[PDB]
Amino acid sequence: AQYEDGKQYTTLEKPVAGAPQVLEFFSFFCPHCYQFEEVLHISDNVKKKLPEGVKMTKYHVNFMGGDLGKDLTQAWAVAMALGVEDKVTVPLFEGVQKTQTIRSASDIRDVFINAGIKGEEYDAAWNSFVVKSLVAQQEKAAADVQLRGVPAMFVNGKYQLNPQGMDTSNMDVFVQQYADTVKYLSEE
Amino acid sequence: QYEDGKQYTTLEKPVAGAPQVLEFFSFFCPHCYQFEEVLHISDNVKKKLPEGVKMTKYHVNFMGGDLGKDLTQAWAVAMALGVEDKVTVPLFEGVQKTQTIRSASDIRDVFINAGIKGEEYDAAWNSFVVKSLVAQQEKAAADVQLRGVPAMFVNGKYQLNPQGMDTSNMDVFVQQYADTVKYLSE
């Protein structure tokens, strides 16, 4: 396909060195993040089109939902630290936005317990230095790209995906176009 | 614990004859989506209001451009027909979740799917009552010098300050907010 700067993507005026190859930002509070993940499966469809040598990274943001948003960012750090993102993503989105059973950090904890992560194992991770580092890493990455909203995706610290410049009439087509754009920017 | 500057602020220029409880929002605002779809602020405020106190909710158009203008007019229609409870969710989801709402025609579809007759909507849309209601919403925003949403005003005198409330627990937040409105109203 024809790829144009300003159309399917934009080019950062202030590129970032040492950024993840493919960096996605989300919030468990965000309805369009919910749409991206639970409905369109944007991440999975992007992964399919990348060589497996190109790693995908996903960070939570805290600028949504106040202190609970910060707790969710810490919980996402636990998920990353323990490698259980694929177990907790769906019940966290459902819990925050659909069933509205996630109202505080203790409810987040129960989701991890039900996903197979024992209470003592969750608490250990929650209070670990590795998780404190991952929280700071997520915050720093957002600040380094001057992030103001979600969902957002950056490639090689150089480009930002521009879904608004893509064909949004057909959702199957949108997803293919989105994923193909990430591929093109990465194959650089 | 109820301190000016904490849970609320006082308007330098109070508004005479303003609605008792006045909320402003935009269907384009992610923070308004949070307030309405996740926190259900309006509902919980209503539950704590004294029986003789009514809630007023207006749409603002400083975001979203021409469609923002159309959404303010659609909200007028919603108010004129009394169908706010039928269209709020699909309008919020259509603009922000699915992003299916991009024109006036898309807005109209939501009303139809919500069980509101097609001749009803078009008569309302083009009515003087709706023209008046659009101007009413615009006047109210100007009267309180509105610079952001979501926002809530009590008696044209006090503005809610959610920044001064506890956000660790969403139920605790919602109830501190609802209680503040009640304290200011009483």
Binding site: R148, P163 | P30, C32, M63, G148, P150
Partner: peptide, 8 residues
């Protein structure tokens, strides 16, 4: 995307 906070 659009910023979260709704000002101006």
């Amino acid at each position: 995307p659009i910023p979260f906070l709704s000002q101006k």
